[PDB]
């Protein structure tokens, strides 16, 4: 009612010569917010021998206060490719590992799994056994050394493997006929596939997972979790910054 | 398929003036626009289109009294690291470099009251001999005459005279590219006044603009204060 200002008048609000543009919104571009490296996870290695476990690239669980945590929670359905950096930190005296040969293998959404030592390198007694799937072949293997290695890390790009045209970050259903608990918001292969780190370290070190999700596609906006306690009435939420009264 | 490469000997060295830039880690930043006036582009512009005020015994002017004659009134070793320049813009700007080049313009503004009048011989004396000490000595050289009461302000151009394609912004124990000469103002006559009990002296401000052919080169870092 009445609209454009100055007259005390009922529905009549005042004028607003709305703003110009700068930045063209671009930072809030879902594809851009997601194409960078995130420190998601931290895990330890496996000994070259034993009958070890594969690890799963599932950045959909969350709960850890991390920005990329939420954001993936912001949408119902997601699709993007993957990109890694694995860094391996030291947890003892760095002079313990002279070699430090690390085997890594990537497993695509839905690959077979049981592995036991099965490859045997020998030479001058002693002789090493690497893992049955640590080996090089079909799924990409990546071997790197950490011995003065100016950056104890390795890295690469890996495609959207799932058999699902998109991934439901939420699922009002079960992924199995047996409607068991655990099988709730599940639906199998709703992730990026898996990896196996294995080495004569394993002890002496932890890892550093890092994902970069290029080509981000987000479908169906969802409620965006608060992330901070509710401040008191009629007040602000004061925080420490690059600004502030010095 | 890998390219064949040889790691040039300096390979992991730093070097602080690389003609090239570092790798970006925060792209897509569009910045807000700025109207904000007077953005200068080059430092020589403000130095040319701008007068600084000289330095003599602490003040930016020299005095004429109702008693003077040939005693030189204003004298300065033409060098950027000269005294009467110390306070100024041009001089201080040049500290940022190694070599200067060109003429400098001097602006003398006589500021004695209108009841007052006087005259001076501003002269420039070439860096040979052992410096003149009386008007009749300097007169044989480049100079003009200033009758305050024709113009109350006057400009004088200290030229560039040297085998030196460039000159020394950082002077010292007298070298051939260390000095370009001497600026001297002398008192041609003395202070005539309507009533000498009120106006007995006059103050001529003396300012320095950068010369049109003036230029600077070879940016340098600062040595120990001294």
């Amino acid at each position: 009612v009445t609209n454009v200002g100055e007259d005390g008048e009922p529905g009549e609000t005042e004028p607003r010569h709305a703003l110009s543009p700068v930045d063209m919104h671009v930072h809030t571009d879902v594809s851009f917010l997601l194409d960078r490296f995130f420190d998601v996870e931290t895990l330890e290695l496996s000994n070259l021998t034993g009958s070890p476990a594969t690890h799963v690239l599932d950045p959909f669980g969350s709960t850890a206060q991390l920005a990329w945590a939420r954001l993936l929670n912001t949408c119902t359905y997601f699709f993007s490719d993957l990109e890694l950096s694995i860094q391996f930190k030291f947890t003892t005296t760095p002079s313990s590992v002279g070699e430090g040969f690390v085997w890594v293998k990537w497993f695509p959404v839905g690959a077979p799994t049981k592995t036991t030592d099965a490859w045997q390198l020998e030479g001058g007694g002693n002789s090493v056994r690497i893992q049955q799937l640590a080996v090089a072949g079909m799924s990409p293997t990546v071997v790197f050394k950490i011995a003065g290695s100016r950056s104890q890390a390795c890295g690469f790009s890996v495609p959207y493997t799932s058999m699902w045209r998109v991934v439901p970050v939420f699922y009002n259903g079960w992924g199995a006929p047996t409607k068991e608990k655990a099988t709730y918001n599940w639906l199998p292969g709703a992730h990026f596939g898996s990896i196996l780190l294995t080495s004569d370290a394993h002890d002496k070190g932890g890892c550093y997972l890092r994902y970069r999700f290029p080509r981000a596609n987000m479908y169906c906006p969802r409620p965006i979790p608060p992330a901070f306690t509710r401040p008191a009435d009629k007040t602000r939420h004061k925080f420490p910054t690059n600004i502030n009264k010095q | 398929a890998p390219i064949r490469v040889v790691s040039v000997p300096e390979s992991d060295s730093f070097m602080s003036s690389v003609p090239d830039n570092s790798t970006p880690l925060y792209p897509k930043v569009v910045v807000p626009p700025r109207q904000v006036p007077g953005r200068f582009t080059n430092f020589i512009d403000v130095a040319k289109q701008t007068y600084s005020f000289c330095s003599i015994s602490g003040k930016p002017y020299f005095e004429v009294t109702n008693t003077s004659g040939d005693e030189p009134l204003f004298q300065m070793d033409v060098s950027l690291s000269a005294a009467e320049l110390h306070g100024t813009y041009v001089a201080s700007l040049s500290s940022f470099f190694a070599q200067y080049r060109g003429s400098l313009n001097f602006y003398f503004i006589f500021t004695g009251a209108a009841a007052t009048k006087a005259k001076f011989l501003v002269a420039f004396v070439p860096p040979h001999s052992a410096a003149p000490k009386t008007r009749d000595e300097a007169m044989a050289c480049i100079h003009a005459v200033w009758d305050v009461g024709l113009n109350s302000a006057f400009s004088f151009n200290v030229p560039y005279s040297s085998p030196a394609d460039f000159m020394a912004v950082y002077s010292a124990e007298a070298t051939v590219v260390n000095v370009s000469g001497w600026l001297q103002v002398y008192a041609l006559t003395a202070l005539t006044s309507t009533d000498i009990a009120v106006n007995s002296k006059g103050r001529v401000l003396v300012a320095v603009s950068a010369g049109p052919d003036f230029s600077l080169r070879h940016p340098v870092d600062l040595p120990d204060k001294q």
Binding site: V30, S31, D35, S157, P159, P214, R215, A216 | P27, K28
Partner: peptide, 21 residues
């Protein structure tokens, strides 16, 4: 979105990433 180099296509559009229909 955020891929900005020139060498970003050092590898093919086909090899590098994934491809829709």
């Amino acid at each position: 979105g955020n891929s900005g180099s020139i060498v970003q296509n050092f590898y093919m559009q086909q090899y590098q990433n994934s491809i829709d229909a």
